[PDB]
Symmetry: D2
Subunit: 303 residues, 4 copies
Amino acid sequence: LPNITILATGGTINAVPQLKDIANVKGEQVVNIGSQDMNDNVWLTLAKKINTDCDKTDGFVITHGTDTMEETAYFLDLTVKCDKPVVMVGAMRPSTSMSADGPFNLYNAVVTAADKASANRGVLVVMNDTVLDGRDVTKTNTTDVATFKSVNYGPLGYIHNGKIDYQRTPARKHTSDTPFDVSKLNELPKVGIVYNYANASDLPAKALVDAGYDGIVSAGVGNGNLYKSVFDTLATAAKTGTAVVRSSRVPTGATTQDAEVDDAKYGFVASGTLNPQKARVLLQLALTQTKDPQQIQQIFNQY
Amino acid sequence: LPNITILATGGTIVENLVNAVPQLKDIANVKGEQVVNIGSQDMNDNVWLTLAKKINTDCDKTDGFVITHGTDTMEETAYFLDLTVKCDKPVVMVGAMRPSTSMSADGPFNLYNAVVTAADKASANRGVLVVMNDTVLDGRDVTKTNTTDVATFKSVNYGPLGYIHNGKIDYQRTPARKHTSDTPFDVSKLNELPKVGIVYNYANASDLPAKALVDAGYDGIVSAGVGNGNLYKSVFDTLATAAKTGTAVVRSSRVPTGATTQDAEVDDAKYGFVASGTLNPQKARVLLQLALTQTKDPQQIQQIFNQY
Amino acid sequence: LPNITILATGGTNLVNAVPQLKDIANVKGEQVVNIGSQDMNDNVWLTLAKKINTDCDKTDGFVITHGTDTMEETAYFLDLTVKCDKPVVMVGAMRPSTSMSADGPFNLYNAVVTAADKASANRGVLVVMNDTVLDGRDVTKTNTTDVATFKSVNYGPLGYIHNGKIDYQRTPARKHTSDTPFDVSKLNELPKVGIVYNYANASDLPAKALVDAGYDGIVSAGVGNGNLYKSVFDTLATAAKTGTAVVRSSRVPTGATTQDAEVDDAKYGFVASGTLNPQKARVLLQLALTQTKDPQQIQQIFNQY
Amino acid sequence: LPNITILATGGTILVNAVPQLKDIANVKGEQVVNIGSQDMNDNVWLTLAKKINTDCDKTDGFVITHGTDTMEETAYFLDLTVKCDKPVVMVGAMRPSTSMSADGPFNLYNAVVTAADKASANRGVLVVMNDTVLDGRDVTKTNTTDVATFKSVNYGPLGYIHNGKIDYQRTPARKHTSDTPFDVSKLNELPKVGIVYNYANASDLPAKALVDAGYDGIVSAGVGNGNLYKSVFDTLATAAKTGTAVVRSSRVPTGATTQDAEVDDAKYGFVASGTLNPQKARVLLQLALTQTKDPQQIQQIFNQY
Ligand SMILES: N[C@@H](CCC(=O)O)C(=O)O
Ligand SMILES: N[C@@H](CCC(=O)O)C(=O)O
Ligand SMILES: N[C@@H](CCC(=O)O)C(=O)O
Ligand SMILES: N[C@@H](CCC(=O)O)C(=O)O
């Protein structure tokens, strides 16, 4: 039986004795927080722990709150150098509720971490019998157990009776193929997100610029478009060296280059299919390597 | 043939407009007028107030309205009009996802189908509508789901009202939430709306955006929460102060479908917060701005978020 | 607390298994039949409709426990034939009751919540699955294994359930229950209606077999917008002019089979199914054929119910 | 500029109609057949595969124009039988070419973009619709009328087209094209494979008619996870004991028909289709039956292709 390590971070999730049939499980509590309070320190702790302990185990399961699981998963997807299975899991219903989903979710997460075919696919999220890549995976519904979906490119595999039929793998570079190495970092660059909508205030953008943030992600309208006062603030900030990534509040589809915004004129980067919170993760890691907008665009084209 | 007015606001898609789609002559007598000409990314309160007053004043001059609009904020304008318009004739918004000069431009047929919808007497009394990709969507639930797809507009929580086939609608649904002439919102004498901003939640979220809106004395803040309207700790701290110091706080969600419910992780009664239900952040802003024309009381604003 | 009757049919003492039911209703259960829903049949339908119609004034609402494979068919049949306008809610489970994170317990709880809600009345027969209230006409099984499989794929759900409360935002506009003319109170059998599939190189032999057997009706699971393979079109065009009702439906999982597209139904004596998928179109055609054999009247029925 | 061949088969969809084609490729066309895809058939399939295989070295890529109704079937057939590793892209239109906002022109443009992109080579036969690149195996028509109808409903698209560029992020893992054992170079006919539908009260007459005609194979559009109405099960179990190949697929539009569920396939000699829907399972079963009649070897083929 493979050796699988469970790293607990919190969320609503031996209670699952069927685990004994598929792995030798050992658990460590890393932190114990609601994922709404997830932060850079937890990310840095987790990446360092997995990278340090990679040769001690045959794979990892991280138990985590569902609210920001999609952000942690992408961060680990870029910063983990262990190419053994690394699987995130949570639960949409409390462990004491009727038809609690956590027990099966955990079993399936361990199935995935124990499958040697899971290796080399990047950091995964396993939820509702489905194996999802950490890049595209997002919470689509506030309450449904089936909430996690890879909304642009689809899942990697489906789990039936403890087996995975894998039909896909992510093409974008991940894990040991990225340049991001947080082994010596105790902090990450400051990156904030501003929302666009009718009559949008420029005060949020201005507050982040006044505080000297390293980067700002715009949750734009449509294809990453900006309310004019937000555009003005971010254009000024980019000329003073703030990195600016245009993403979109729209829940599927890319924010493209060569659409309505002249990104080369303003020094802006287009996020592609990365939603605002995922775009933040990649921007904060890009800013550990470069402040140059063309190099940041290349990073957003490859990772 | 019904009289249909086109009110143009901007976006990809009025004798220029009418003449591009001569088939409109088969289904309506079309007239209309350019109200403003802006990209919808720059849509604002002044345009909303102009449009609502124009529709309400002109209601008896026509049998129905089509508003041509940019797609990026169509869903916001639609909900504003759905709450403020007192004309119960068909009011239909329409845009285009591809430029009118592009191969397989969607504008022409979208406009045709919008006039079909505005010309159908069965469209009356269903609130303000969005007609896109052969589908009739209610102004409350309709949202842009995809950055580029022609099929982007969906009613992601409760579904469409009707589908259009060969110029006919089969209506199977109508919105239960009160709209148009059944709301108390009356903007006929307003030149400005209450100031409502939106803040995003994510890992390590800054409190600076929320603090900036409190410092400026905003009437309201809508939170684009994580999951079921949950707040990053530092944003919670700021919004807790806001709600006790004269700024209404609505918890919505960045998550694209499903309700932000009462009786979940946040004790809204203790903080003086309101839960948005299925209204996404930008839609929640629309109703909060209109609620604040009537009341500053959080229990009354919650009642408004449970009825409209 | 409302009185709720659970009518068991099969699929995957319930106050003991789900003790929380005691907090929301007074439940009594009766076993009507015990079958896998892959074996659902006209006789079970007729028994259920008569039982609900007879028992309507003895309870405040019904939950029917049912296999998920044909729940969408039974639900529509009941939606057309039940004359009780008290809540009638069907429920199943996609995971075995002994499996990890079994869905049946909470599904049944939510079904009783829905049947106990006065707001559920007058909405027709419902399906409650995965925290969602779905109308019996549009509701369909979209996925072979997912707990979230049941969706109203054309017009969407009526309401969502959170903490035992429903926020209803929609009701079906099509006539149902006490607003239909269908009355099965005296019937022990239904008109014979079969389904044939269309695909590249499709055999005409299935269609021919049902005509040779004297079926009252045939539903076509057409390609695209209810289109028919040439040899199937030949068989059904003859059948429609020689005493067999023919409904064009679609194997395509969403959208209508429309009037006024490629197939001129008026001229062939065919009926277009609209959004009804083949198995749902069969339900309405069997019930239409209890009233009329006229293609124009059957089309009107497919336009109203 | 690449040389691209358009092979026309019929459906709603010339460098004259879409002059922007001249910017991206040197296009030449040939009419192979001119039929509505509802009438698609084995003879057209054999003609197309042998034409692409014969003509592979004369061009840099192929676009096949086809009706939308059975495009998903032709695409998978070609995906299994084409040995040309150059781009092979199928395309259609959901609106007539003379209608307002006709989608054919841009669809054709994007199909040629895809066929011209060297990164399209080695992905198997593709469908390009609504600015999306779809693999031939998973692609299906999900809506009767929507221009956005074509989706890869289980595993998602391979890439998206923006301003004439493709961002490819996925590729099919199942073996296709020059990696399959199927070779139709010398066939003038395909094994006879029919499809029967399951529903409540299903007739066994369709299944019996196909067995009486000596069909090589029968695909079942099962309920739920490939389940069978009792009388259909009985007919197909009898047929499989006399050598008829039997594939269990599902009428349910997404998800696998799995091994190890309610049906003991090994005991009956049945094959589970996995994610292949009934019409797709027919394609693979017809081609499997050119190699083997053995149920275990047919199952292995359904596990690999
Ligand atoms: N807000 C909680 C929700 C419960 C959970 O998903 O575990 C969290 O994300 O931690
Ligand atoms: N940003 C533009 C896009 C073009 C359009 O949708 O009309 C707008 O929303 O106006
Ligand atoms: N074939 C079974 C599946 C199990 C169940 O859903 O109860 C049925 O539909 O009855
Ligand atoms: N029945 C026609 C529909 C029109 C089209 O898709 O071209 C066909 O599939 O050929």
